[PDB]
Design a protein around this ligand. Structure first.
Ligand code: HEM
Ligand code: HEM
Ligand SMILES: CC(=O)N[C@@H]1[C@@H](O)[C@H](O)[C@@H](CO)O[C@H]1O
Ligand SMILES: CC(=O)N[C@@H]1[C@@H](O)[C@H](O)[C@@H](CO)O[C@H]1O
Ligand SMILES: CC(=O)N[C@@H]1[C@@H](O)[C@H](O)[C@@H](CO)O[C@H]1O
Ligand SMILES: CC(=O)N[C@@H]1[C@@H](O)[C@H](O)[C@@H](CO)O[C@H]1O
Ligand SMILES: [Ca+2]
Ligand SMILES: [Cl-]
Lengths: 466, 104, 466, 104
């Protein structure tokens, strides 16, 4: 049964509905495609339906190497002792490496441009070529791994390929772990939130559960409220580049050809380091672009993101907003006035109460997003708690943590504490302008950009074996 | 699981000595609170017309998306403290952490 | 595949192996029958194995009225219009009452005494014919419900049978609830356990989980530690029966004929009233009678209860003893000296250490039973911590609790707060002498015995509708 | 089930208005701690000979029962504070609470 060409409400098909006087879809008989998630127990009338996972929960750079044996066996290079990774053979972007191509029965990449015949990409996940900056990031990571493996081989001649491969993978995993934690975490939760939720590391603990929960999956999606409706570019010396300096986000989805035939990956990054984000306000909740023309060129009718998210939340079977307020030990409002006081607003609470019957039925995502943010943070007093609890559970359970005893020496720990993303960018390509302390904070030119000449380097002398 | 090892496994198995399955792939999620459904185990809310949730009707997702999320685009405000790196780092982290399969 | 006559280790079978030099069985080729639990999801290699339950977890007298609609319909009497249960026809116990019979394909009841030709009984559960005492208790409960229903009907003439039936069920459930709590609970754990784990009832809660735990089951198996090897009877004047004053065990299992053709149930109750129990000690744990000749007649070889308990514990998959010690928040021993000091016996510590190797591998039952007893109690700290939390969770999650507002009235509660376990035997049997204050504490004769007239009753005038 | 009800139900549904199916029989147990198996999901310990648990050999149940549980029968010590009503009521309560099925 095809749901993309039918509206019958039979399993596994869960179509949406539209109200009267819709600004876009004037015909009320239309449908929006939707599918239910795959159950865990297929047919049992006793247990409760549950979903399944597909990737390892530990932060071990699983987005590049994979999580299944055939996939990782088909991504390596078995024709040489060096044990490097596989790269493309037909196209080159004037640099040193590029992602390999892929073959599929149904390729959405071919429909973007009929005369380009550029197919989609392949990586550790199926959604690599869906947003081009993701593709650039994956390419940069692959180049970094290749360079590290080459240098490590050059240091010691008598090793074998497998040892070099595993060593490079371990180095990359520990390095991405440390950068991600130490940079991302302080700029989201805030000082007090982490001082209360994340104490200092003490030792390994095998009595904790490192699994993941549905609530984290549905609550980590706040970033959808920061969308910028355009894509920009620059050149070697900072200035808009002709032709086509600004492109709408609508005609860029699933368009990987713009990465191959034009540009050369570098201008995308150059635009990335020097553009501010979007602030969130109680009356500017989400950009119109993602709500009107999402995946327009690949389907018949454009879809809406927030409606899709709320439909998924309802389908997954999650409790109400009041239950989650009670779960975190916070006061639970019941009346309209209490909602107004707790929301630090009046009109928004009035609209929420009008559109529903009681605060107990408020969905998780709208309740979490609509709340006022904290000071020096970008989350409310509920999403922050959920994210912090999940991250703490994920941290203290992994046995191969880099700070754990028995996995690294004192010299390696001493010399591995000064790895930064700007050095990564300045070393892996021709980028010469970076920020000083936090690339997530410095966002201006020329008062916040210096050449990477005044910057340290990572050394591997301690890794020498003799 | 072997009594000794030195490198991470390809799929994450045998990471926990007492219970090897915990944390591996192709497993089920975990539940922090009991789930709620239309009839108790499988049917979701809104599948059967004319039913109420906690004594009140349930609105449509599209209607609530149209009424509240809508906002004019000419009154944008740029954040002066944060750059655009947040999108890419969040995308990497969430694509690493989890992925829910969907029937074709 | 018939495990009752085979020993091949093929699923779903799991026989028990016999160590060399067994005092009872000499040959090493023998096997002990055993069955495996029913999996929740058949033929699934994704989820973790789980078991099933088939009874309501709430304490609402579900052992008499059944747990399924067809069983409740079958048990009810629909011939006349009063609202009544079913009774036998072929026999009578001095003209008072009797339980109805049951039909089975291959019953074990007819085998124990061929000349008797007496079938089994029918009740709300399938394990009621193990000993005559359980049948006596069930008959007493049925007679009490019968008398209550008759009195309630005699009060109001306007009412119909269904209302009387349901009201009698509610009254019986409330009675058993208050009796079991208010009497049994303080005499097993102790005053400190009541102070710490069971505070005073405050109000109803709807966010608690009333489900029964998987581990809890095995904990209650502690009740297997105190069983006398004999059975006694005595007449109205308290002297033993003639003949057969003391009948040994291993000959009364599945003996339905004893209740029917050997007097009835009153002498069994009289013997039950005035006999002391067994005291647990660290060198005397399990009685030999139920460990070497258990179910001897019905099967080819007798089994042992502790071995079956250990096998079931292993099959379920519960963790070790140290993990459960850590769960409640108690110190975890590591070496022989620490364990010996904890148990206050070095000889027992050495005895356990030769066999179990390390303290982590000790099963839950053996570790829990071996713990030293509390003062004014019967279990160790670990079993107390396990039982108290479960019972507290069960208490605070029942919407039909007798103390909840809107279920009863003030005068009704005042009248109902008087019921005691005695005054039921007096009003339902021919017994005239019972204990004084607690049926579970007074056992010395005739120091704690009074007459039947010095016992108060209950009035139902409030329940009259007009 | 209707908004207004007075008396109990045979099966036990709508005892928790938020989740009507909680504990109404024919449902799996709840795990306070994660399970443990030799294979990981389906095999108990002591199935395949030669497989050690936590680096130590497994012990037969019958041997353990013969070692420590054994005690002479002519040295019984009665308890001078409780009667058999204790054990009988305990057994009745256990029969009331729960039950586990087995294949035939
Ligand atoms: C380029 C930026 C982003 C998108 C394009 C985008 C869109 C989606 C869509 C269509 C889904 C549903 C199907 C899918 O898995 O792709 C989706 C789900 C999830 N997102 Fe999205 N989003 C973009 C931006 C972000 C940011 C900044 C995120 C986090 C900081 C983020 C997270 C997620 C997550 C975790 C999911 C869940 C995936 C699932 O299958 O449930 N996204 N996004
Ligand atoms: C509680 C409890 C159970 C659990 C019931 C269940 O899991 O089904 C239990 C079980 C058993 C078993 C194991 C086999 C089985 O029931 O599937 C046997 C063989 C058995 C027989 C006897 N029972 Fe028992 N037992 C539980 C607790 C108690 C208590 C608690 C106070 C008493 C008393 C008691 C009595 C006996 C008993 C005495 C000689 C035998 C034999 N049981 N039950
Ligand atoms: C499959 C693949 O891309 N293999 C490449 C090979 O083409 C290239 O010549 C070599 C140089 O080191 O690196 C590797
Ligand atoms: C409509 C469209 O995108 N057309 C493109 C064109 O812009 C590009 O110059 C050309 C290069 O081959 O490929 C085609
Ligand atoms: C099922 C059954 O035995 N029902 C009996 C009924 O036959 C009898 O008439 C009645 C008298 O009170 O008692 C009850
Ligand atoms: C050996 C044996 O158990 N014999 C009994 C007998 O004592 C009893 O009188 C009779 C009653 O039916 O049942 C048979
Ligand atoms: Ca991973
Ligand atoms: Cl959950």
């Amino acid at each position: 049964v095809n749901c993309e060409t039918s509206c019958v409400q039979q399993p596994p098909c869960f179509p949406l509905k539209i109200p009267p006087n819709d600004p876009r879809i004037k015909n009320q008989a239309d449908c929006i495609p939707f599918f239910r998630s795959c159950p865990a127990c297929p047919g049992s009338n006793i247990t409760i339906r549950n979903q399944i996972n597909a990737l390892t929960s530990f932060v071990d750079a699983s987005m590049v190497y994979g999580s299944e044996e055939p996939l990782a066996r088909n991504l390596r290079n078995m024709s040489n002792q060096l044990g490097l990774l596989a790269v493309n053979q037909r196209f080159q972007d004037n640099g040193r490496a590029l992602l390999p191509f892929d073959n599929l029965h149904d390729d959405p990449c071919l429909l973007t441009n009929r005369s380009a015949r550029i197919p989609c990409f392949l990586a550790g996940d199926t959604r690599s070529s869906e947003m081009p900056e993701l593709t650039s990031m994956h390419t940069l990571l692959l180049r970094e791994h290749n360079r590290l493996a080459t240098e490590l081989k050059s240091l010691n001649p008598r090793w074998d390929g497998e040892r070099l491969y595993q060593e490079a993978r371990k180095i990359v995993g520990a390095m991405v772990q440390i950068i991600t934690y130490r940079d991302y975490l302080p700029l989201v939760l805030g000082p007090t939130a982490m001082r209360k939720y994340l104490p200092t590391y003490r030792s390994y603990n095998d009595s904790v559960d490192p699994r993941i929960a549905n609530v984290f999956t549905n609550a980590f999606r706040y970033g959808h409220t920061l969308i910028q409706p355009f894509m920009f570019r620059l050149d070697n010396r900072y200035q808009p580049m002709e032709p086509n300096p600004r492109v709408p986000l609508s005609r860029v989805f699933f368009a990987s050809w713009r990465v191959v035939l034009e540009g050369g990956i570098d201008p995308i990054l150059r635009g990335l380091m020097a553009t501010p984000a979007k602030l969130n306000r109680q009356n500017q909740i989400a950009v119109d672009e993602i709500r009107e023309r999402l995946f327009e060129q690949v389907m018949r009718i454009g879809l809406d993101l927030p409606a899709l998210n709320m439909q998924r939340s309802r389908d997954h079977g999650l409790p109400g907003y009041n239950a989650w307020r009670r779960f975190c030990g916070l006061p639970q409002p019941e009346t309209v006035g209490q909602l107004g006081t707790v929301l630090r607003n009046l009109k928004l609470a009035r609209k929420l109460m009008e559109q529903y019957g009681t605060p107990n039925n408020i969905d998780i995502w709208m309740g979490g997003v609509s709340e006022p943010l904290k000071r020096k943070g970008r989350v409310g007093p509920l999403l922050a708690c959920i994210i912090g609890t999940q991250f703490r559970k994920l941290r203290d359970g992994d046995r191969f943590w880099w700070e754990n005893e028995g996995v690294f020496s004192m010299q390696q720990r001493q010399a591995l504490a000064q790895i930064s993303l700007p050095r990564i960018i300045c070393d892996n390509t021709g980028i010469t302008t970076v920020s000083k302390n936090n690339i997530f904070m410095s966002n201006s030119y020329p008062r916040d950009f210096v050449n990477c000449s005044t910057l340290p380097a990572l050394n591997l002398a301690s890794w020498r074996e003799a | 699981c072997p009594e000794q090892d030195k490198y991470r496994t390809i799929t994450g198995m045998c990471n926990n000595r007492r219970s090897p399955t915990l944390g591996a792939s192709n497993r089920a999620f975990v539940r922090w609170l009991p789930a709620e459904y239309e009839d108790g185990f499988s049917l979701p809310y809104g599948w059967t017309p004319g039913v109420k949730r906690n004594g009140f009707p349930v609105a449509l997702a599209r209607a609530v998306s149209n009424e509240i999320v809508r906002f004019p685009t000419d009154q944008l405000t740029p954040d002066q403290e944060r750059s655009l790196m947040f999108m890419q780092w969040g995308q990497l982290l969430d694509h690493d952490l989890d992925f829910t399969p969907e029937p074709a």
